[PDB]
Amino acid sequence: DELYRQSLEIISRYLREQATGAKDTKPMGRSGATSRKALETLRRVGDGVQRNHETAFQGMLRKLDIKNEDDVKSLSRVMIHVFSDGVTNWGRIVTLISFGAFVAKHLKTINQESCIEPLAESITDVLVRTKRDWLVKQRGWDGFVEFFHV
Ligand SMILES: O=C(O)c1ccc(-c2cccc3c(CCCOc4cccc5ccccc45)c(C(=O)O)nn23)cc1
C-alpha cells in the first residue's frame, strides 16, 4: 500500500506541525517531491479552512469529547459516517485533514501530544480505505497539489 504510506507521511507531519507550530524536520525515507509540495499546500489552504469552519469544528470537537488515546482510537466510525455523505472532492479531503489538525492542536492543549501519531494513523486509514478508487483516478497527491496550485 504505497498510497497509505505516502498519505501517512504527509498527514502525520501536517498534524504535528499544526499541533507544535514547528516546521517539521524529520527526514522521510527518501526524496518525496510531491509529498513536500502536498505539505506546502496543506500549510497554505488548511489554515483558512479552519478559520471558515471555526464554529462547526468546535461543535464537532465538543461532541467527540476527546481526552485520551482510547478516545482517539474510537473516532474511526464517526469519521467514516460524516466523510462518506454527499460526494467526493478535494475540498472535503482538505476538511478531513484540517479538522485532523484542529484535533491535533486540541491534543497538545490537553497534554496528550502522544495521541497525535495514532490520530494521524486513523485519518490516513479512513482516507485511503473510503476514497481509494477516487484518489487513484485523481492521481493521488499530485492531483491534490495541482488542484490548489498557486
Ligand atoms: O454544518 C456545517 O457547515 C458543517 C461543516 C463541516 C463539518 C465537519 C466538521 C468536522 C469534520 C468534517 C468533515 C470531514 C469528515 C469527517 O472528519 C472527522 C469526523 C470526526 C472526527 C474526525 C477526527 C479527525 C479528522 C476528521 C474527523 C466533513 C465533510 O466530510 O464534509 N465535514 N466536517 C460539520 C458541519
UniProtKB/Swiss-Prot annotation:
Job description of the protein: Involved in the regulation of apoptosis versus cell survival, and in the maintenance of viability but not of proliferation. Mediates its effects by interactions with a number of other regulators of apoptosis. Isoform 1 inhibits apoptosis. Isoform 2 promotes apoptosis.
Post-translational modification remark: Cleaved by CASP3 during apoptosis.
Membership in a protein family: Belongs to the Bcl-2 family.
Cross-link Glycyl lysine isopeptide (Lys-Gly) (interchain with G-Cter in ubiquitin) mapped to chain: K23, K26
Motif (BH2): 133-148
Protein name per its UniProtKB record: Induced myeloid leukemia cell differentiation protein Mcl-1
Cellular compartment(s): Membrane; Cytoplasm; Mitochondrion; Nucleus, Nucleoplasm
BH3, short sequence motif: residues: 38-52
UniProt source species: Homo sapiens (Human)
Motif BH1 mapped to chain: 81-101
Induction conditions: Expression increases early during phorbol ester-induced differentiation along the monocyte/macrophage pathway in myeloid leukemia cell line ML-1. Rapidly up-regulated by CSF2 in ML-1 cells. Up-regulated by heat shock-induced differentiation. Expression increases early during retinoic acid-induced differentiation.
Subunit structure: Interacts with HIF3A (via C-terminus domain). Interacts with BAD, BOK, BIK and BMF. Interacts with PMAIP1. Interacts with BBC3. Isoform 1 interacts with BAX, BAK1 and TPT1. Heterodimer of isoform 1 and isoform 2. Homodimers of isoform 1 or isoform 2 are not detected. Isoform 2 does not interact with pro-apoptotic BCL2-related proteins. Interacts with RTL10/BOP. Interacts with BCL2L11; may sequester BCL2L11 to prevent its pro-apoptotic activity. Interacts with GIMAP5 and HSPA8/HSC70; the interaction between HSPA8 and MCL1 is impaired in the absence of GIMAP5.
Effect upon mutating K63R: No effect on ubiquitination
Effect in UniProt of substituting K37R: No effect on ubiquitination
